[PDB]
Symmetry: C2
């Protein structure tokens, strides 16, 4: 009864926002997957279909980040990511639409899987889209510090740079998923759908931080579960909360976000970032062969593997409805060809 749809939107109204993707994304049922698992009814939110260089969740963040860049009058964009980063590909594409170049620092987090990982996938797309890959740094490099040194160098040359953090996960970027929460609330109300759980893959933290902020701000009752793609449970929850609280302050919402709203499950990380497990690969095959939907072996694939295992362990009732947010990532499949061919 106390639900307050539009409260988030009213705080978002004072922030600039560029139209870069195709919104709202569809919210649709997965009937073959739901029958195969024999548990709750599974719905998918298609944030893979944002329309920006094969789409993805990073597109929502970029609509706020690049509006803010344009507001500052930036004339070059800087960001960073792992070799096969989706954020990097979408940032370059988005910046090209706005007529701006993008300088990129890539991090060699993963060096397995041969030449296809090095040169296909998101790397091929980065090149076609005209990204300026300034350096490939070793795993473990302070990537944020390297971007700030680059930014200062370009400033001395006369540029006005805007630095976008890894995954776009600043409080401004998290506003994109505050907006998604409101879009998911209206969508499901219009479809007469009662959402009992939201599940998605959580990484640099902006997607979960924005969703948690939007859901708490509208007094929605919907529990949200992040499936970690890298960090352990306690570390990921602390970073999500910290960013979500910084986003709560940016929106100017009084008080504090409930800490019990941040929940992560890290049982599906496997050996580390960008390393799929055999459960990751099954999730990809199940979603492609039962639903014609393409996941990815780094992010959405681990998020779905988490969901499939939770259903199989009996965590949900048949009359419950689960929303899986498809966060995208299909372009990365091609960097993983050596592993698929085994």
């Amino acid at each position: 009864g106390g639900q307050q749809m539009g409260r988030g939107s009213m705080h978002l109204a004072r922030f600039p926002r560029l139209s870069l993707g195709h919104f709202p994304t569809p919210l649709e049922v997965l009937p073959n997957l739901s029958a195969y698992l024999g548990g709750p009814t599974i719905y998918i939110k298609r944030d893979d279909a944002t329309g920006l260089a094969t789409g993805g969740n990073k597109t929502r963040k970029l609509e706020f980040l690049l509006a803010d860049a344009q507001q500052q009058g930036a004339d070059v964009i800087i960001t960073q990511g792992a070799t096969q980063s989706n954020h990097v590909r979408q940032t370059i594409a988005a910046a090209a639409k706005l007529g701006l170049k993008t300088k990129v620092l890539l991090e060699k987090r993963v060096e397995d899987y041969g030449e296809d990982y090095q040169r296909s996938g998101n790397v091929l797309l980065d090149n076609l889209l005209g990204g300026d890959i300034i350096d490939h740094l070793p795993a473990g490099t302070d990537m944020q510090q390297a971007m700030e040194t680059l930014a200062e160098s370009l400033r001395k040359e006369g540029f006005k740079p805007y630095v976008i953090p890894g995954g776009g996960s600043s409080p401004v970027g998290a506003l994109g998923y505050v907006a998604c929460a409101e879009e998911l609330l209206f969508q499901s109300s219009q479809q007469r759908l009662r959402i009992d759980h939201i599940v998605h893959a959580t990484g640099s933290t902006g997607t979960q931080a924005g969703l948690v902020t939007g859901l708490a701000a509208t007094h929605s009752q919907i529990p949200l579960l992040g499936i970690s793609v890298r960090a352990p449970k306690a570390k990921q929850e602390e970073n999500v909360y910290a960013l979500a609280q910084r986003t709560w302050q940016l929106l100017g919402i009084p008080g504090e976000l409930p800490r019990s709203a941040v929940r992560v499950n890290s049982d599906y990380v496997g050996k580390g970032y960008g390393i799929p497990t055999e459960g990751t690969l099954e999730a990809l095959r199940l979603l492609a062969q039962l639903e014609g939907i393409l996941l990815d072996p780094v992010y959405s694939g681990k998020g779905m593997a988490g969901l499939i295992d939770l259903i199989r362990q009996g965590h949900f009732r048949a009359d419950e409805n689960i929303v899986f947010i498809h966060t995208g990532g299909s372009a990365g499949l091609f960097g993983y060809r050596q592993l698929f061919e085994q």
Copy 2:
């Protein structure tokens, strides 16, 4: 009046119709709008999704229990057919034609092939170039009927009259958008291949007396052969709907100046079109189909074939998954 025909929900329609202000200013001619049929949402999308919404609905009404189709190695139609059939809990039996044998291991194993395998396609055979693929399919279908199957054979590119109904619907969709958006459409241009997209658009634009010129940029066949084929399919699609009168032959126009060396072989202008669209608009074309379509649009604007006050709608038909099949060519520049 397409509700008389069965239609399944496979894609996300209507697709956006957006202006491209960077490309339009760079070329200095008319205003270019892009219809985003690369964003149908079916296994990275594409024009083939529109056809399959009617092909697989008709197949369901006939009680089909297995789909058969065919295409070249990097066929976008094969990928989308496997994905669409998977949604119905149907398997797909695929024959591939080895039209192109350049571009190395990525062409053979990446791109649409990687997707075809992940989506569970059953590639029955890799046939040599020039094979009568429709006859190969009919032999497979008859062989499956003896095993008790009820197969539904989809022709190459989904370009039967039923499939072309997909772009008759797109024509109505485009008219409504430009009407609400208050946009005068002066020309429509798109890459034309197996003929279904153009035959459907011509039949829709003509049945409503829209008077919008349509140009198909061929990806393979020469002009006269392609116009003959589009016109024949558009006529059967005209009769399938019961439209009064008959379809005018002057409505079918094709330009085949951008085929280059043949199917799946991009020219230097094809690759320039891919770079311009990616760097000016963040939009990914493909070197087989939509990139050749855009190379033709770019070249005709440079020839002053259009005035600045005209509005061009380019239908982005998709194909970006095939970019990965062409990595080795990209890595030469």
